[PDB]
């Protein structure tokens, strides 16, 4: 996160850290959507251009964390992956279209004050909250600037941007399964996700029932916090049916 600030304790109880077994290092962000399922970006697991192709045993998920590097004894919880599912039409070749993946935890995680699942949007909530100008919240332990790292979870609030403006800011072909967010050049304020924030949750708090919903996933961008540029996120609701299918049959 660039131009963000330290999150307060228990502010994002669904925030998950994708940790690599060897060498031990931060790999990506993710989110808890139930006691057995974690949601993240597909490029976090598979991306041939950089020889990235992880399997269930190469990773660990750390839930309930705040500090980036410390093992927060008695607070955080580490779980192993049982199975990983990448979207069948994930396009890593052209534009990271359908950049989404589900991970099944070996054992259910016990909820607490620092561990709680975020809600998955339904058609009504998505139609109501996914509007240009409406702000969302992104969190992660990623880089602070374009390439340095934060000691604690970073949070930043960003506005959703009109599709047209997103389209005219890059040569990358954008699809309906993605959206972009960030402040425009003349809005004064700034901020963006960056390398390391990948897979992190983009959430919004519903004014109707007070619940937090995950609308997007940190997918891609060009640089970090560059003027005229915007961060792109996987459109969660658009892929809700694939998400439900995987969960109901597996």
């Amino acid at each position: 996160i660039v131009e963000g600030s330290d999150a307060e304790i228990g502010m994002s109880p669904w925030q998950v850290m994708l940790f690599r077994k060897s060498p031990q290092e931060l790999l990506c962000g993710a989110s808890l959507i139930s006691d057995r399922w974690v949601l993240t970006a597909a490029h976090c697991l598979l991306y041939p251009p950089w020889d990235k192709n992880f399997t269930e045993n190469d990773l660990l998920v750390r839930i309930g964390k705040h500090s980036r590097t410390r093992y927060e004894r008695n607070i955080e919880k580490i779980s192993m992956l049982e199975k990983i599912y990448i979207h069948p039409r994930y396009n890593w070749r052209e534009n990271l279209d359908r950049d989404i993946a589900l991970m099944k935890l070996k054992k259910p995680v016990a909820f607490s004050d620092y561990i709680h699942p975020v809600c998955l949007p339904d058609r009504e909530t998505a139609a109501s909250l996914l509007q240009a100008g409406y702000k969302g919240r992104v969190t992660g332990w990623g880089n602070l600037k374009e390439t340095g790292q934060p000691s604690v979870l970073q949070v930043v609030n960003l506005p959703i941007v009109e599709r047209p403006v997103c389209k005219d800011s890059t040569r990358i072909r954008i699809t309906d399964n993605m959206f972009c967010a960030g402040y425009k050049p003349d809005e004064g304020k700034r901020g963006d996700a960056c390398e390391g924030d990948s897979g992190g949750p983009f959430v919004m708090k519903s004014p109707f029932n007070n619940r937090w919903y995950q609308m997007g996933i940190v997918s891609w961008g060009e640089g970090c916090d560059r003027d005229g540029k915007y961060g792109f996120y996987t459109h969660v609701f658009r892929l809700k049916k694939w998400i439900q299918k995987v969960i109901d049959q597996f």
Binding site: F19, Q24, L26, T69, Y71, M80
Partner: peptide
Amino acid sequence: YEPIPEEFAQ
């Protein structure tokens, strides 16, 4: 990063 307990590495 601070070392993760061994029993999770399995």
